[PDB]
Amino acid sequence: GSSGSSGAASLGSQKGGITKHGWLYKGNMNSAISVTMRSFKRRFFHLIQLGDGSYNLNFYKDEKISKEPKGSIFLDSCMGVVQNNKVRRFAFELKMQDKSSYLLAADSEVEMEEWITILNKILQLNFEAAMQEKRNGDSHEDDESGPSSG
């Protein structure tokens, strides 16, 4: 043959979940400030639930998603949301686990708190989800988007 271990399993989810969408202000983050913001750019951050139960924050150039986003944040790794303030009045840093952190910022405190609450939610929930998934096999899922072309 080649490889493969009788397909997979333990794939599926249950109940609804969370979500959130809006234009945020992603940054580069670094020592200095001018670098931390490196020209704070605005992008449409869309939240989507992976085909398992986890949540991934994917941001696009605009609201029109569906297509390939600019990137995706593995909240599954996200450690927690911190509060910068230095950069901007309403700016929070995402403490990732893959050695790195994103500089998010909203237009208003709310838009800044909401995310801080959303991400944190999935972040904190991600912790309880692990222990929940660990002892939870029975589950059904489905994934299939853009197989291939030319």
Side-chain angles (χ1 to χ4, degrees):
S2 283
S3 248
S5 69
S6 208
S10 271
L11 287 158
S13 268
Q14 257 137 323
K15 221 208 213 102
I18 333 172
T19 157
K20 168 139 211 53
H21 53 289
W23 294 64
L24 260 176
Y25 267 56
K26 211 189 85 136
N28 217 25
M29 245 280 149
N30 249 278
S31 271
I33 200 97
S34 290
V35 61
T36 226
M37 47 149 102
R38 264 233 215 185
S39 319
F40 250 33
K41 259 285 177 144
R42 181 188 222 172
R43 233 110 196 156
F44 189 72
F45 279 66
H46 157 226
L47 179 66
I48 146 156
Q49 181 195 34
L50 297 329
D52 202 26
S54 44
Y55 263 40
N56 264 9
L57 187 73
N58 319 340
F59 48 95
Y60 298 66
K61 78 213 179 220
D62 331 294
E63 307 150 320
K64 305 222 93 102
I65 68 219
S66 208
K67 301 215 210 115
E68 283 217 52
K70 308 254 116 209
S72 32
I73 297 137
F74 309 140
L75 321 190
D76 171 20
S77 287
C78 180
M79 313 225 88
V81 183
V82 296
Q83 266 226 4
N84 274 8
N85 206 107
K86 269 282 191 89
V87 189
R88 245 227 138 71
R89 253 288 159 189
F90 318 112
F92 40 110
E93 155 155 73
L94 294 308
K95 301 298 207 119
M96 272 247 107
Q97 110 178 44
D98 223 19
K99 273 242 224 188
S100 156
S101 31
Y102 306 108
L103 225 189
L104 267 44
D107 225 352
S108 273
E109 63 187 286
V110 49
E111 261 161 294
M112 175 218 51
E113 89 178 26
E114 309 227 288
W115 281 116
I116 284 172
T117 264
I118 257 42
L119 301 184
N120 276 355
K121 247 195 190 162
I122 294 97
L123 276 19
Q124 273 238 333
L125 281 29
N126 259 327
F127 196 121
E128 324 202 309
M131 296 290 216
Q132 262 204 321
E133 270 204 47
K134 221 178 134 254
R135 295 249 223 168
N136 193 71
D138 301 303
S139 79
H140 205 215
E141 245 276 312
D142 40 273
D143 41 83
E144 191 79 39
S145 223
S148 47
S149 214

